[PDB]
Amino acid sequence: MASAVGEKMLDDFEGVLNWGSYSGEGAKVSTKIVSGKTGNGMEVSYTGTTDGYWGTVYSLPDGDWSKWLKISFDIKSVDGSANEIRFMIAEKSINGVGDGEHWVYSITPDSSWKTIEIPFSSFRRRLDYQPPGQDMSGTLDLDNIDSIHFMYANNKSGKFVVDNIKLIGALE
């Protein structure tokens, strides 16, 4: 730890890749490390179909960040396209099986680097799909997070880079 601003880095891609990519049923993925907005970055590549799927997954060491934190990441498009993607956040189960609640938000990139900061206040529940070992609170609980997922939100192809994935929070 360093005795400064409440900013907490999560990932910055300066070491070996540590994310869980997947696709299927006529949809496809490809993924590797690159040069990023700072030092190294990660680049992903996707191919869609109307009923197929693609995504990639991060496993947190620490999963409470309530009272005042926001998230921030840097992103840029390497197809030039403004492809529609979504985040999904899984909450902890009160039973200790699977997940407790599923929360979503859709976003779009640009052809130059963008610093996407989100206050967590923009997310909603996944409406047709939720887990059985649930909390069902209608509150996204930054006391008790389980995992985070990047996912398809469209059926076309696309390619992009990401870096600088952190929590932010100060008086400024």
- From 27-35, 55-63, 140-148, 150-158, span contacting Ca ion (CB under 5 A): 140-148
Q: Give the chain's radius of gyration (CA, Å).
A: 16
Q: Which of 38, 66, 106, 115 binds Ca ion (CB under 5 A)?
A: 38
Under rule CB under 5 A, residue 74 binds Ca ion: no
> Residue 100 has which token pair?
């407790």
Q: Residue 107 Cβ, how far from Ca ion at the closest point, in Å?
A: 20
Q: Residue 121 Cβ, how far from Ca ion at the closest point, in Å?
A: 14
Q: What are phi and psi of 24, to 5 degrees?
A: 180, 175
Whether residue 48 contacts residue 154, with contact meaning beta carbons closer than 8 Å, is answered with yes
Q: How far apart are CA 135 and CA 51, in angstroms?
A: 29
Between the CA of residue 96 and those of 92, 133, 146, what are the distances in Å?
8, 8, 11
Under rule CB under 5 A, residue 101 binds Ca ion: yes
Q: Which of 21, 23, 36, 109 binds Ca ion (CB under 5 A)?
A: 36
Under rule CB under 5 A, residue 146 binds Ca ion: no
The binding site for Ca ion (CB under 5 A) comprises 12-13, 36, 38-39, 91, 101, 135, 137, 139, 141, 163
